[PDB]
């Protein structure tokens, strides 16, 4: 029951209570209690996921053994397995927690079980400051998830212009193809992100067919993004005005 | 430094020397000393990697929280980072150490920093008993490393017939693709593993082009495995013998 | 003309008229008049094509030689060559005659010159009871015509929901591709049969480009069936929601 | 057994023994004993299969109804089902028997159960004089077997340059694709038949990838026919010599 | 400047004023003045561009070498560079001026700086008589501009039915592709020229994807030309009306 | 005829003779004689094609009217139509003639009838000094010939390492695809230019399938360039050594 009481105090950031529950315990005892999993998650992972900074700081100062341990977290109603504290904090948008974990020696490229990096985690809900902090702390831009979907691809798919712009400047590969032949240009077409598509084209992104035989023009047509259909048809027909 | 002497004793399995070193130290000092990193590795990770079963039992009985700490390990010249003790024992083929770590509550799916599981670690050098033990102790067959290379793929590539057979019978997905579009059929073609290929086709593994535009037939042709080519051309031309 | 008089009675199902025409003829003379062809077709073929059970029984009891002899039959003003009696009776919906020919040892996989089986014949105009009888009497589900259009693909095109369901239950391969590259899902997409499409995918159907480089999604997009379009774009993008 | 004795004499071409075995009985009993099937084949089919001309013409006089009746025949350790006497004679290379069966009113396009025409049967082993005679007596050049493999395709695969030339001259479709997407250009490539390939290209032949994503050049490369490989690499690169 | 006064007079076709200007000047002085460039163009190019037939005759009678000199011309706001007189007269639709220049020995295939022929120039605005005169005066139908766009292509794009009809009858290649993979069928589909498309298919024009991954059917679908879509879908689906 | 005598003197560079042949003629007369074509070529074109510098200088000082006129020239036994003097000088490697033509106002991007630029002309036989001179005089690197084959593509195909290196530094588009889908990487593979392939990859060139389904690996395999096969198979399989 003490392990459960410790986990419950850590998950809800009740630092006063946790201090009292660990009051006269040894290093071995505290480390064991703080590194155990409850319902597939460690106290640190939960403190990090819900952004309890003081709680994160306390647990890391007691023991850092669980800093790389991936566990069960929930986002958009779905369970994500093997997510380490840095990924969860990055995905949930807790910048000070991201900074605390990195200051305590967290691995910037340590992924979930599906090979999603903390940088990819921050790009999904568009946490620009976290993206910059991670890139500044040697996050690899080319580590894609198991689908071969990159940080640049997901930023375009979600229409995060500022993040896509930053990734491009930092040297993100515009012509990377996912497992199914998807490129960042297709992500733009599907989200109707005309300004990001223009950026990619400025960084020499090429129009390509994906595994489904779809080019970005066709992806825009089937998703009803007429802004991108108009732009690409005009781009294709402009040289026909030449006598 | 005493911390260094403790590390060497754990690494070289000198259980008699270590106890003389941790003689006048309290459980608090012992716990702190056997949890400290030297050369980017803990004493437990080194004891696990070189299969000192008595040493593993001793270190775990002093500090239980060290069980998931990932660190630097050396395999075939290369230095692998963030490897937990269970991964290292699985990769070096120490079955008793694997059984011991799992009995002590080690996370069966805790990966290296490149998302390699103990199950994948064991599949590389072909440690069949460790493969079956991890699988029966709920190892995820579908967690792939950073390149999207699965346990089934590496088993097929190294020509481990018995391991590939066991993974298929336990329900490993034959149609998984790596980030570069590699399938288990390509691993067979590149290693001339015709027996394993026939097994994959019994599980209806589909012939697909990889990211280099190569189907398993073309991969076998450019790598000189005429045994695979002769089979696949013969099988694709078997209808032409028929009247 | 005696040969013409025999052919006309058999086609019209005039058993009493035929009995009088053969009354003063020897067994060998009867077999010659019943195996001869008038306008590319035999008397047994016309009796099968126009569902005359009594007539078919009489002809087979006299001479069985014509059981697998293919000939010319008309359907929608189109003349189909080399169609044997079992195919003609299946195509025209004569369950009584189908059963009789099988009882008299007709070949269940015997095709027209275009490699159309009696199973594909019944699937076209949707004769469910005939489909069931043929499948129960060892008819091959996967023998496609000269275009590689299978029994499942044609059932989906005409909108026969009950026949498509029976075929899928009996293990029809929905991942099959035609000579052009058509899959069962294009026919659904071209009619706007979402319910039938959903049924094909319930049995895990494969998306493939046809001989026009068209997938079911694109087929639906150009035929104006937006309900299919909306459905397949959402399905294609599902892996992009993964964090 | 009398039924066996009659079948055996017909297969062995023993005319004297057969007419003595049927000398008594009656015409009705002879027509009944000569129409019965033994081991899935009629006496007439075995007579035509092993090319016993005098035996075939005798059995055609006793009964002219068995001429279109198909059965079981053996060729290079395999059984072909529902093969009519004309098919077996063309396949085994019995020109004079083919000439007699057609003179006695045999269906020139009557196929096996796998939709193999006698024209395709002669094309396999390369009976040029039979190919000519069958085409001369209106054999449909476009009737392909169940796999969709045409007469031209099998002539190219078996290296019969003379038969392939004749079929081209008579108007065979070079662009025809099988159920597996195979064309004659591929068959040329799979055989090493450069001279037939040159002929196809003299009539402007189109290079297309099959259902294995293989072009004739790739097909020739994996089957080790470097003569065709060298020819098609040079041909593919011709526009690169343009200044 | 007299050079400027001579230029304006030739441009405006003021033949009366020009002779008063070239009054006391020797044939050597006239030759040098009439060949000089103003605003990047010669007096003859300007006389040809604005169809002053009397002026053209006069300037050519003074200097013959000027007939091929290319210069700057204005068309629909845009400034075309290196246009010879024959190109400008063709584009502006001045038939008598085109006829006069060819009677004076002008090069029928001399192009602008973007490789546009007088034949292509005449095709753009649809000057049928100039198209027929140039073709009958040995104009090369297959010289395409810098984008690989042919006379047939622009004719198809601008909807010039009679011009496209004449080009096909004179043997223009229907299967030419531009640098961006555009074919004449795509020009038809983009302009809704269904009459011209039907014409191209009579010449066996092949349906191909362009550089944007579009077939003529998909190009028509995204540009809203339902007439083309309804035709091509109905044509690809007409076999499926057959019972 | 004097015109033929003038052409012959100009073609063979006999300046002393040409000076004596034109000795008393007027500007109009000289201009007419040196601007006329003999056997499809002008005196200037022939002087430029065979590198008669003094002759080029003399003809240009008399009249420059023919500086952009394309004519008939022969290279590698083949006739090239509509080649202007600058293209011919660039193709034949006459650097001083190239400089003279540009000094006299020649258009650096004026092409042959097949859209081949003087820059593309210099890249074929590898005239590095001419390539550098043209690029320094605003030659467009991206103007491809009618096949969509670029300056970079032809430099790689011909194994001109120094030229490919220079073009890459000047911003040549590495990922440009020809009409048939050819990329500069395929040109390297077919010529076995392993050093140039490494350079292209360093400049972010991507491995792609051409219209024939060939990737650079396959193109290298069919042309027997095992050095490139070895490099690309090692490149593809290196991540498989990772535990």
Curated annotation (Swiss-Prot), chains A, B, C, D, E, F:
Changing residue 187 to A: Reduced binding to C-degron with an arginine at the C-terminus. ANK repeats lie at residues 1-30, 39-69, 81-110, 114-143, 147-176, 180-209, 212-241. Widely expressed. Highly expressed in kidney, cardiac tissue, skeletal muscle and testis. Expressed at lower levels in other tissues, including cartilage. Changing residue 149 to N: Modifies specificity for C-degron at the C-terminus and promotes increased affinity for C-degrons usually recognized by FEM1B. Belongs to the fem-1 family. Substrate-recognition component of a Cul2-RING (CRL2) E3 ubiquitin-protein ligase complex of the DesCEND (destruction via C-end degrons) pathway, which recognizes a C-degron located at the extreme C terminus of target proteins, leading to their ubiquitination and degradation. The C-degron recognized by the DesCEND pathway is usually a motif of less than ten residues and can be present in full-length proteins, truncated proteins or proteolytically cleaved forms. The first seven ANK repeats at the N-terminus (1-242) are essential for recognition of Lys/Arg-Xaa-Arg and -Lys/Arg-Xaa-Xaa-Arg C-degrons. It is linked to A dominant de novo FEM1C variant was identified in a patient with neurodevelopmental disorder with absent speech, pyramidal signs, and limb ataxia. Component of a Cul2-RING (CRL2) E3 ubiquitin-protein ligase complex, also named ECS (Elongin BC-CUL2/5-SOCS-box protein) complex, composed of CUL2, Elongin BC (ELOB and ELOC), RBX1 and substrate-specific adapter FEM1C. This is Protein fem-1 homolog C. It comes from Homo sapiens. The gene is FEM1C. The chain holds residues 2 to 244 of 617 of the full protein.
